[PDB]
């Protein structure tokens, strides 16, 4: 399946104008869900708001999120 990738931080401020588009902003990060592929969108959410957003504004598989010492 797509399994958990991880995130996908925002490059591009966008600016979701229907309900079916992740709302997405510069600084933030994009919670990885679904990945239809390496080309296309890719499916995640942000504070809860779900949508899809092209993986040409955003950037994954940058960092980690290692637990607290």
């Known amino acids: 399946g797509p399994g958990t990738f991880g995130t996908a ?3 591009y401020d966008f ?3 229907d309900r079916s588009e ?3 902003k510069e600084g933030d990060i994009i919670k990885i869900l679904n990945k239809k ?3 296309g969108w890719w499916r995640g959410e ?3 708001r779900i949508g899809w957003f092209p993986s040409n504004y955003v950037e994954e598989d940058y960092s980690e999120y290692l637990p607290e010492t």
């Open 15 to 17: 600016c979701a104008r």
């Open 46 to 48: 942000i504070y809860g």
């Open 37 to 39: 592929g390496q080309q």
């Open 9 to 11: 931080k925002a490059r």
């Open 22 to 24: 992740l709302s997405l």
